[PDB]
Design a protein around this ligand. Structure first.
Ligand SMILES: *[C@@H]1O[C@H](CO)[C@@H](O[C@@H]2O[C@H](CO)[C@@H](O[C@@H]3O[C@H](CO[C@H]4O[C@H](CO[C@H]5O[C@H](CO)[C@@H](O)[C@H](O)[C@@H]5O[C@H]5O[C@H](CO)[C@@H](O)[C@H](O)[C@@H]5O)[C@@H](O)[C@H](O[C@H]5O[C@H](CO)[C@@H](O)[C@H](O)[C@@H]5O[C@H]5O[C@H](CO)[C@@H](O)[C@H](O)[C@@H]5O)[C@@H]4O)[C@@H](O)[C@H](O[C@H]4O[C@H](CO)[C@@H](O)[C@H](O)[C@@H]4O[C@H]4O[C@H](CO)[C@@H](O)[C@H](O)[C@@H]4O)[C@@H]3O)[C@H](O)[C@H]2NC(C)=O)[C@H](O)[C@H]1NC(C)=O
Ligand SMILES: *[C@@H]1O[C@H](CO)[C@@H](O[C@@H]2O[C@H](CO)[C@@H](O[C@@H]3O[C@H](CO[C@H]4O[C@H](CO[C@H]5O[C@H](CO)[C@@H](O)[C@H](O)[C@@H]5O[C@H]5O[C@H](CO)[C@@H](O)[C@H](O)[C@@H]5O)[C@@H](O)[C@H](O[C@H]5O[C@H](CO)[C@@H](O)[C@H](O)[C@@H]5O[C@H]5O[C@H](CO)[C@@H](O)[C@H](O)[C@@H]5O)[C@@H]4O)[C@@H](O)[C@H](O[C@H]4O[C@H](CO)[C@@H](O)[C@H](O)[C@@H]4O[C@H]4O[C@H](CO)[C@@H](O)[C@H](O)[C@@H]4O)[C@@H]3O)[C@H](O)[C@H]2NC(C)=O)[C@H](O)[C@H]1NC(C)=O
Ligand SMILES: *[C@@H]1O[C@H](CO)[C@@H](O[C@@H]2O[C@H](CO)[C@@H](O[C@@H]3O[C@H](CO[C@H]4O[C@H](CO)[C@@H](O)[C@H](O)[C@@H]4O)[C@@H](O)[C@H](O[C@H]4O[C@H](CO)[C@@H](O)[C@H](O)[C@@H]4O[C@H]4O[C@H](CO)[C@@H](O)[C@H](O)[C@@H]4O[C@H]4O[C@H](CO)[C@@H](O)[C@H](O)[C@@H]4O)[C@@H]3O)[C@H](O)[C@H]2NC(C)=O)[C@H](O)[C@H]1NC(C)=O
Ligand SMILES: *[C@@H]1O[C@H](CO)[C@@H](O[C@@H]2O[C@H](CO)[C@@H](O[C@@H]3O[C@H](CO[C@H]4O[C@H](CO)[C@@H](O)[C@H](O)[C@@H]4O)[C@@H](O)[C@H](O)[C@@H]3O)[C@H](O)[C@H]2NC(C)=O)[C@H](O)[C@H]1NC(C)=O
Ligand SMILES: *[C@@H]1O[C@H](CO)[C@@H](O)[C@H](O)[C@H]1NC(C)=O
Lengths: 834, 832
C-alpha cells in the first residue's frame, strides 16, 4: 500500500515577496488577539448556521467580521441577481489570458458586492487525468501550462477586485467515485476511507502541482485541500503535499481551508498544515468540531504549539489584507438557505433574531457582455467545409435537438443544475450559480432568421425522428444540437454518479445527427458538453458540413453561438483537450469498483505524465481533433522562427514566532452573558476541565506516539533546494531563451490566431512535445506581427527525484511552433543552457 | 322525422347588380363550349390527382386553366413559404371591419401568387350554436350581425386581391359529431346517413342564414354546401336551402361547390342547385363520379336539362371573371401532396410526366405586420386590477405554462395541427396552414425583459408545480398561459373528436393558475383557445390581477401579446361570445349519442334563435364576461343619444348557351392517355347505360325527379327576393342613431360602441346586436358616432308571409360598451 512520508514542521509565514505588507499588518493584528479569537478565524461556525456556504465567526472585539466563503468557480452560488459565467473549460478553450482575467474581475466584483469575502474557486484540480472525470469542466485543461496561466489570470482578476480567491482542489481529486465515504455508501459501496491517489514525485511536480505553483506565484490567497487521499493520507492532513510541496517548496503564504467534510482530525490536521476548517463541524450540524473548542484545548494542553495556531491566524488575516478585503467589508447581504426577505438569523436551527436575511442586491452590472463575448470566443470550430459563417439568406433553417431549447422546469428548475434538460449551459453540483435568465440557441438563432425574414423551426424532442427527417428534407441548413453532461459526485443523473459512464452523446444525440445528415446535405453539429465526446460515427458523414464545440457557455449561450454562426465573431477558440476515436484511446480509466476490499479504493496513476495528448502521442494514436485544434474563417501562416539565448535566496528560515499570549483555561470558558445558538460551533470550553470539555474519546491517549517527529519543532529550518521563492526558487523563473515567429493573416477577414509553442525536452521517458507558451493575436486580412515569448529555466527542466529539484537534463531540446499539437511546421534545436 | 319541402326549378343566373359584366363575359365564353367542356368546369379531377385540395380540369381549347381550390380560411394550407394568419374568431374579437378586410387582402395576395384561383373560406357556418362546437373558431361569432359584417369584409378583401372566396359551410354544420358516415364509423358509431340539423324557418332566417345573405350581397363568388342534412335532405342536394333560400331568396349569382365527400347523387344534386363537385370522385380515388361522365350522360339522355348545366358553367365562369382571375392566371406552382421539388405530375397514381411540382415561391411579402397587429388588436383584456400595462422595470418575471413555450415537434410538427403542444396559435383540421415560423410568448416576453436587463424564466411543464411555486414566490409578476383546443371532426386529440368534450382548461390549466396565484400577489392569466373556457374557479382569486384571452393568433403570437402587455398596443378587442359560469349555462348541447337507431342522428335546434347571449339573457343568467366585453388601458364615456326618422316580379325563361350533339361527340379522344383515378367528362362508348355503369341507370327515372325540376319557364320572384342578399327594400335606411363617445382616460385607444335593438314580442331576445364600429380616440378626444338602422335590422321573418316584417310591438334602441353595459336607450318611433 502506497505511503505518504511525513514532513514537519509546518512551515510558517514570512512576508515573502508580494506578501510583505499584508504579513506586517496580519502580525500587528493577530498580536492583539486572545487565543479564542484566533481559533475563531480558523473554524467555520457550522453547516447552515449563518449566510454563506462557509462562514467563520470573525473577531468582533477587533472589528473583524466573520469571513464569508461562497461557491462557485463560475459565479455566485445559491443567491440572486447574479450572473452565470461560462465554465472554466470554456476559459481554457479561449486560450486568452485577457478573457480569463476579465472573467475573474467580473466575478470578483459580483462576489464583493454580495458581502462575500472568499470565492471558492477557480479550480485546477482535477487537472483532467480521465476524460470521464465528473469535474474536469470546473477546471481548465489536462495540460499544465495552459491550465496554470489561465488559473493564475483568473485568480488575479478576482483578487484585484478585492475578494480572496481559493485555488482548489489541492490535490489529485481526479475522479468523483469514492471521493467520500457517506457519498459512496449512498451509492451502495462500503469503504472505510476515501479513494487514494497514488502518484510518483516526478509526475506530481510536472503535472498536477504545476498550475498550483502558478497560482501561488500569482498571489492566490487561499487553497482548498481535497476529499481524496494521497498515498493513503487525507488531503486535508497530508504533511507531504501541505507542509512540503505547497508550503516549503512553493513558499505559499496564504491559508489552507478544508473541503466541506474533508477535515478528519484536530491535532493531526493542524500539525500537517491545515489553516481553516469548513464548514466547521465534524459532520453537518453535528454540533461537534475537530477545531473550535478542541483546538483551543489542544493549545492549552501543550499538544499543538502556539506558533502553529498563530501562523494559521496570520496566514488567514494576511490573505484578507492582501486583497484589501478590510476596505470593502460588509456582512453577507443574502442568504444561501432561503430566498425569503425575512427569516431567523441562524438558518439551520431557526434561531436568533427574526430579521432581514436577503437584500436582493443586483450585482450583475453589464457583465452579460463579457459572458457573451467569452462564450463566443470559446466556441471551437472543429470542422467547416465552407458551411460557415451563415449569411442570413438561408431560406429555411432547421434547429434540431433538445440541447437547442428550453429547460421545461425553468433554467434553474433542477437543483444545483442536477439534470440535462434543454440546452446545456452549466453542468452540475457545487460549481454552479443561479442563472439570471438563459438565452437558448433556439431563441437566438430563431430571432436572427426572423430578422432576415427567413423561415425557421426548432424541433426539441430527440426521439421525434419522423418530424426531424421531414424537416431536414426541406431545410437549407440543419443546425443539430447535442450534449454530454457531468458533475460533482453527490448528484446522479441517469445513473451517472458525477463521473460520466461513457463519452457518448446523451439523449439519442448520435441518432439525431444521423437522422438529419441522411436528409440535409448541410448538417451543422453544435456540441455543448463538459469535455470530449465520441464523434466517430458521424463526423466524416458527407452531409455533416461543420462541427462546433461550445462547452458550457453560461447565461448568454444562444447569443454567443449566433455571434459565431453568423460571422459577427470569427471563431478563434482551440480545443483544450483531445477528441479521440474511442474511450480506450485515452487510457486513464476511472476506478469504479472496490479494489482494496472495504478499505480505501486505490487509484494508481500508473500512466505517469501521459494524460490526454501526451498519452495519444506516446502511443502513436491519431486523434480525430487534437489538443490545440480549432479552425477560423480566415487563414494564418507561421514563418521566420528564431531563437535567442538570453543573459540570466535564503538557505534557512527564521525560528517560528508567537504573537500575543496564552493564559489560563479559565480565560476561555463560555462567557456568561452569551446565548449559545444550537449547532453553532464556538472556540469555548465548558469548564477548566480540559479533558471533559473536549468530549474526545481519545483525549490524552498515547498522545506523544500520535504526534509525528518534528511536528512541534519551532526552530529555523533548511530551505528546500526547489523552494525559497513564490511558486518555487526564483531562479526557476529566469528567462533563458527568447523565441520569435512571424504570424500573418493570409485570408479575407479579420480573426484571431493562437500561436502555440511546444518543446521536446528529450529523453527516453518524456513526451514528444509539451505546450509551454501561447497567445491570442488579432490580425486584419494581410496583417503580420512578430510573436515573441520567452522560455524560463522551469520551462526547460524536469523534476529530478534524487536532487529534489528541477534540472535541465543533458538530452538535446527542440522548440516547435504552429497551430496545434499536431500542426507544427516550424522547428528549431535549442543550444545548451543551464 | 323532419322533412325538407321541394323547391324547383333551380334558379338560373341573370347578371344582377354588380354581376352584369362578369355574367355577360361568362355567357360569351360558355356559348362557345361543347358539353364535355362545360362538364369539365363542374367536376373535380379526383382526390390528389393534381396540385390543389380541389381542382377541375378546365377548358384547354379555350385557354381556361383548371381551377385550383385550396384551404384554408386563415392561410394557404399544405404549401410552403406562406403566412399563418389568426383565426376567424380573432377577427371577431377585433370588432374591426377594416382589419377583417386587410386580412382578406393579405390572404388573397398569398393565394393568388401560389396560382390558387379559389380560397376555401372564409367560414360563418358553424355560426356557433354550441360553445363546444369543434369548428366555431374557424368562423366568427354566434352573433349573426357581428359575423355577417366581418364575413362580408373578409370576402371583399380576398376578392379585391383577385381570388374567388368561398363562403362556407352552407348551412347548419353546427357540430362535428356524426357529420360524416365514414368518420362516425371510425369512432364506433353505425349510422346510415349524416346528422340532420332540424331547424324552424324563422330561426334559419334570423340566425344561420343572415351572414350568408351579407356574404352574397358583398359579392362572394362561391358557396360550399355542408356535410350534414337539413331536415333529412343532404346539404349538397337540399333544394330548399340551395334553390329557394340561397338562389331564389338571396339572389346568389355565383357557384355552389360540394364539401369533400358531401356529393351524394348526380341527377338529384344538379337539379337541387349544386354547381360543382369536389374533389370530383364519389369516394376519394374511387375512379367514379356522380358527375363528370355521368353528368354528360344525364344531359345527353334528357334527364338533366341543358339549361341546368349551362347555368352551372355560367355561374362558375362569372365568379372567375368577377374577381379578374383570368388576368392573374398561372398553374398552381406548389403541390399540396409533397414538398419535393420534383415528382410525378399526378400525385395519387404517381403517373404522367416526372417534372417540377414545387417552385417554393415565397408569397409572404410583409404580411407578418398585419398578423402581429391583428393578434394584438384581438387580445381581449377580460380583467385588469391595475396590473397592466407592464413597464419593463419588473425585476423578475415568471413565464408559466406549456402554452407559453415551443411545440417540441416544431411548430408544424403535428399534422394539420392535430395536437395541443406548446403555445396554441392554431386549432386543427383543414382550417390550417403551415407556419413559416412561430413566435412563442416565451420568446417575445423574455426578449422584452432582457432588453430592460431584468431576470426572467419560463416553466413549461404544467405538472412541475413544485418548480412553479418556488419561482412564483420570487417573482415580481407571474404570467400564466393556459389553453383549450378543438378542431375538425376527422382528428381526435385526447379523445376530443373535433368537438370539445368540455370547456375546462387543458393541461392542468386550472391547477397551474392556482399554484401560481397561491404564491405571487401579481398573477396574470393569458388564455389561448378556440372559444370560451370556464374561469370560475380562479378568475376572482385576489392574487389574479389580470386576465386576457388571445384566441388563436397565428405566427406572430408572442409579439402580438408582448405588444399588449408592454403597452405598445392598447387593447381594444371585445369578447365575440359569452363566458358562462358553467357548461349548463349555455344549453345547446351537442348530439353525442345515436338517437334514431342506426339512421341519421337528429339534431333538433329546439332553442330557436336563443344561442350564446340571447339564451343567457332569456334565462336571466349572469355571465362572468358578457358578449361585447373587453377592457382597455383607458376609459370611455357614451352620451348624447339622438334618434332621427329618415325618408322585378318574374324571371326570364332559362337560356341555353351553345349546342349539344350526339353521344359520339363525347367519347374519349383516341390519342389521350387516361390517367388512372382521374375523372374525365367523356364516355367509353355511345352506349349511355354501359358508359355510366350506374346500377340504377334508366330505372324509375321520372319518379325520382321532383315536380318543377325541369321547368325552364319564367318563375315568380319571391317577396323577400329580387336583389342581392334579399329584396332591395330590406336595405333602405329608416332611422339614424348618434351618440358622443369620449376617451376620459390617459391613454390613446379604441372604443367599440355597440348598438342593440329590442324588436319586442313574447318570443324575441331582450337585445340583439345591430351595429358597431371601432373608433380611435386620443385622451380627452371626442367624436360623434352615427349609424343607421335598415328595414332588415328592424324586422322579423314572418313564416306566413314568407317575408321580413317590422312587427307591431314597440321597439327600443340601446348603445353602450357591451350587451350588458348599455347606459343609453330610447323608444324607437314607429316606422314601416
Ligand atoms: C490536547 O487536546 C487535544 C484536543 O482535544 C487532544 O487531541 C487528541 O489526541 C489524540 C491522541 O492522544 C488523537 O487521537 C489519535 O489520533 C490519531 C490520528 O488520527 C487521524 O489521523 C490518522 C492518520 O494518522 C497519520 O497521519 C496523521 C497526519 O495526517 C498523523 O498526525 C498521525 O500521526 C499518523 O501519522 C502517521 O502516518 C502518516 C502517513 O499516513 C505518516 O506520514 C506519519 O509519519 C506517521 O507515520 C487517520 O487515519 C485517522 O482517521 C481515522 O479517524 C477519522 C475520524 O476522525 C475517520 O474518518 C477515519 O476513517 C479513521 O477512522 C478509523 O480510526 C479511528 C480512530 O483514529 C476510529 O475511531 C474509527 O472508527 C476508524 O477505525 C485520523 O484522521 C489516531 O491514529 C489514533 O488512533 C490510533 O491509535 C489508537 C491508540 O492510541 C487506537 O485506538 C486507534 O485504533 C488508532 O489505531 C490505528 O493507528 C495505530 C498507529 O499508532 C495502529 O497501531 C493501529 O493498528 C490502528 O490502525 C488516535 O485516535 C485525537 O485525534 C485528538 N483529538 C483532536 C480533536 O485533535 C490531545 O490528546 C490533548 N493532549 C493531551 C496531552 O492530553
Ligand atoms: C340519364 O343518365 C343519368 C346519369 O347517369 C341516370 O341517372 C340516375 O338516375 C337514377 C334514377 O333513374 C338515380 O337513381 C335514383 O336516385 C334516387 C335519389 O337518390 C339520391 O337522393 C335521395 C334523396 O332523394 C330525394 O331528394 C332528392 C334531392 O336531394 C331528389 O332528387 C329525389 O327526387 C328525392 O326527393 C324526395 O325527397 C325530398 C326530400 O328528401 C323532397 O324535397 C322531394 O319533394 C321528394 O319527396 C338520397 O336519400 C339518396 O341517398 C342514397 O344514396 C347515397 C349514395 O349516393 C347514400 O350515401 C345515401 O346513404 C343513400 O343510400 C341508400 O340508398 C341507396 C339507393 O339510392 C342505396 O344504394 C344505399 O345502399 C342506401 O340504402 C341519393 O343521394 C334514389 O332515391 C333511387 O333509389 C330509390 O328507388 C329505387 C327504385 O327506383 C329503389 O331501388 C331504392 O332502394 C331507393 O328507394 C328508396 O326510395 C324510394 C322512394 O324513392 C322508396 O320507395 C324506398 O322504399 C326507398 O327508401 C335511385 O337510386 C341515380 O342517382 C342517377 N344517377 C346519377 C349518376 O345521377 C338516369 O337514369 C338516365 N336517365 C334516363 C332517362 O335514362
Ligand atoms: C378536361 O380536363 C382535363 C384535365 O385538364 C383535360 O385532359 C388533358 O387534356 C389535354 C388535351 O388538352 C392533354 O394534353 C395532352 O398531353 C399529353 C402529355 O403531355 C406531356 O407529355 C409530352 C410527351 O413526352 C410532352 O410533350 C408535354 O409537354 C407534356 O409534358 C401530350 O402528348 C398531348 O400532346 C399532343 O396534343 C397536343 C394538342 O393538344 C399537341 O400540341 C401535341 O403536339 C401532341 O399532339 C400529338 O398528339 C395528338 C394526340 O391528340 C395528335 O392530335 C397530334 O397530331 C400529335 O400527334 C403526333 O404525336 C403523337 C404522340 O405524341 C403520335 O401518336 C401521333 O401519331 C402524331 O405523331 C396533349 O398535350 C392532357 O394530358 C389531359 N390530361 C389528363 C390528365 O388526361 C381535358 O382535355 C378536358 N376536357 C375538355 C373537353 O376540355
Ligand atoms: C467568535 O464568533 C462568534 C460568532 O460571530 C461570536 O459570537 C457572537 O458574539 C457577538 C459579540 O459578542 C454576540 O453579539 C451579542 O448579541 C446579543 C443579541 O443580539 C441581538 O438582540 C438584541 C436585543 O433585542 C439586538 O439589539 C441586537 O442588535 C441583536 O440583534 C446582544 O445582546 C449583545 O450585546 C451582543 O451584541 C453574538 O450573539 C454571538 N453569536 C453567536 C452565534 O453566539 C464570538 O464572540 C466570537 N468569539 C470570539 C472570542 O471572538
Ligand atoms: C458542553 O455543555 C453543553 C450544554 O450544557 C453540553 O450539552 C455539551 O455536550 C457540552 N460539551 C461537552 C464536550 O461535554
Amino acid at each position: 500500500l502506497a505511503f505518504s512520508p511525513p514532513f514537519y514542521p509546518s512551515p510558517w509565514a514570512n512576508g515573502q515577496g508580494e506578501w510583505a505588507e499584508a504579513y506586517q499588518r496580519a502580525v500587528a493584528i493577530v498580536s492583539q488577539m486572545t487565543l479564542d479569537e484566533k481559533v475563531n478565524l480558523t473554524t467555520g461556525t457550522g453547516w447552515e448556521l449563518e449566510k454563506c456556504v462557509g462562514q467563520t465567526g470573525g473577531v468582533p472585539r477587533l472589528n473583524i467580521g466573520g469571513m464569508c466563503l461562497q461557491d462557485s468557480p463560475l459565479g455566485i452560488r445559491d443567491s440572486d441577481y447574479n450572473s452565470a459565467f461560462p465554465a472554466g473549460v470554456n476559459v481554457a478553450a479561449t486560450w486568452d489570458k485577457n478573457l480569463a482575467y476579465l472573467r475573474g474581475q467580473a466575478m470578483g466584483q459580483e462576489f464583493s458586492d454580495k458581502g462575500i469575502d472568499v470565492q471558492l474557486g477557480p479550480a485546477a484540480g482535477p487537472l483532467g487525468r480521465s476524460p470521464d472525470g465528473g469535474r474536469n469542466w470546473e477546471g481548465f485543461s489536462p495540460d499544465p501550462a495552459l491550465t496554470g496561466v489561465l488559473f493564475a489570470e483568473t485568480i488575479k482578476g478576482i483578487q484585484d477586485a478585492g475578494v480572496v480567491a481559493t485555488a482548489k482542489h489541492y490535490i489529485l481529486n481526479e475522479q468523483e467515485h469514492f471521493r467520500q465515504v457517506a457519498e459512496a455508501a449512498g451509492y451502495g459501496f462500503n469503504i472505510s476511507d476515501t479513494i487514494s491517489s497514488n502518484v510518483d514525485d516526478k509526475t506530481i511536480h510536472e503535472m498536477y502541482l504545476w498550475p498550483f505553483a502558478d497560482a501561488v506565484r500569482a498571489g492566490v490567497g487561499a487553497i482548498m485541500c481535497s476529499y481524496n487521499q494521497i498515498n493513503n493520507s487525507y488531503g486535508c492532513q497530508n504533511s507531504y503535499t501541505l507542509n512540503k510541496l505547497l508550503k516549503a517548496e512553493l513558499g505559499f503564504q496564504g491559508f489552507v481551508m478544508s473541503d466541506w467534510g474533508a477535515h478528519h482530525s484536530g491535532v493531526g490536521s493542524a500539525l500537517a498544515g491545515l489553516d481553516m476548517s469548513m464548514p466547521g463541524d465534524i459532520t453537518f450540524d453535528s454540533a461537534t468540531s475537530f477545531w473550535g473548542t478542541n483546538l483551543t484545548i489542544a493549545v492549552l494542553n501543550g499538544t499543538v504549539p502556539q506558533w502553529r495556531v498563530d501562523d494559521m491566524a496570520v496566514r488567514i488575516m494576511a490573505a484578507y489584507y492582501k486583497v484589501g478585503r478590510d476596505r470593502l467589508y460588509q456582512p453577507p447581504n443574502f442568504s444561501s438557505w432561503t430566498r425569503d426577505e425575512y427569516g431567523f438569523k441562524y438558518f439551520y436551527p431557526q434561531e436568533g433574531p427574526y430579521e432581514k436575511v436577503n437584500h436582493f442586491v443586483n450585482v450583475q452590472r453589464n457583465h452579460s457582455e463579457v459572458i457573451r463575448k467569452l462564450g463566443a470566443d470559446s466556441t471551437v470550430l472543429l470542422k467547416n467545409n465552407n458551411a460557415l459563417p451563415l449569411t442570413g439568406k438561408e431560406r429555411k433553417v432547421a434547429i434540431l435537438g433538445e440541447d437547442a431549447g428550453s429547460n421545461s422546469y425553468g433554467a434553474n428548475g433542477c437543483s444545483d443544475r442536477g439534470c440535462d434538460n434543454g440546452t446545456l449551459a452549466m453542468a452540475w453540483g457545487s460549481g454552479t450559480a443561479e442563472f439570471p435568465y438563459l438565452v437558448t440557441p433556439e431563441q437566438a438563432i430563431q430571432a436572427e432568421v426572423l430578422k432576415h425574414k427567413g423561415s425557421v423551426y426548432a424541433i426539441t424532442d430527440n426521439w421525434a425522428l419522423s418530424q426531424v427527417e421531414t424537416l431536414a428534407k426541406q431545410a437549407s441548413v440543419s443546425l443539430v444540437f447535442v450534449n454530454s453532461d457531468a458533475g460533482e459526485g453527490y448528484i446522479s443523473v441517469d445513473g451517472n454518479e458525477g463521473d460520466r459512464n461513457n463519452l457518448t452523446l446523451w439523449k439519442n444525440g448520435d441518432n439525431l445527427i444521423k437522422a438529419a445528415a441522411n436528409n440535409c446535405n448541410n448538417t451543422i453539429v453544435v456540441i455543448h458538453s463538459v469535455g470530449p465526446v465520441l464523434v466517430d460515427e458521424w463526423y466524416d458523414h458527407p452531409n455533416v458540413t461543420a462541427i462546433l464545440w461550445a462547452g458550457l457557455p453560461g447565461q448568454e449561450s444562444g447569443n454567443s453561438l449566433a455571434d459565431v454562426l453568423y460571422g459577427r465573431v470569427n471563431p478563434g477558440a482551440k480545443s483544450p483537450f483531445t477528441w479521440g476515436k474511442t474511450r480506450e484511446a485515452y487510457g486513464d480509466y476511472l476506478v469504479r469498483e472496490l479494489n482494496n476490499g472495504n478499505g480505501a479504493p486505490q487509484d494508481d496513476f500508473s500512466e505517469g505524465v501521459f494524460i490526454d495528448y501526451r498519452g495519444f502521442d506516446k502511443r502513436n494514436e491519431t486523434p480525430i481533433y487534437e489538443f490545440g485544434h480549432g479552425l477560423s474563417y480566415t487563414t494564418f501562416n507561421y514563418s521566420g522562427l528564431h531563437i535567442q539565448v538570453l543573459n540570466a535566496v535564503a538557505t534557512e528560515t527564521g525560528a517560528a514566532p508567537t504573537f500575543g499570549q496564552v493564559g489560563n483555561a479559565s480565560d476561555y470558558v463560555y462567557p456568561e452573558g452569551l446565548t449559545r445558538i444550537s449547532k453553532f460551533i464556538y472556540p469555548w470550553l465548558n469548564s477548566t476541565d480540559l479533558k471533559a470539555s473536549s468530549g474526545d474519546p481519545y483525549y490524552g491517549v498515547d498522545t506523544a506516539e500520535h504526534v509525528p517527529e518534528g511536528a512541534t519543532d519551532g526552530s529555523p529550518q533548511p530551505v528546500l533546494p526547489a523552494g525559497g521563492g513564490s511558486g518555487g526558487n526564483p531562479r526557476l523563473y529566469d528567462e533563458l531563451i527568447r523565441v520569435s515567429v512571424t504570424v500573418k493573416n493570409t485570408g479575407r477577414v479579420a480573426g484571431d490566431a493562437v500561436p502555440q509553442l511546444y518543446v521536446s525536452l528529450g529523453g527516453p521517458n518524456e513526451p514528444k512535445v509539451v505546450l509551454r507558451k501561447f497567445d491570442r493575436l488579432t490580425l486584419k486580412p494581410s496583417e503580420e506581427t512578430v510573436w515573441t515569448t520567452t522560455l524560463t529555466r522551469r520551462d526547460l527542466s524536469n523534476w529530478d527525484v534524487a536532487a529534489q529539484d528541477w534540472v535541465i537534463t543533458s538530452y538535446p531540446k527542440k522548440v516547435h511552433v504552429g497551430s496545434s499539437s499536431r500542426q507544427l511546421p516550424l522547428h528549431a534545436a535549442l543550444p545548451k543552457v543551464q
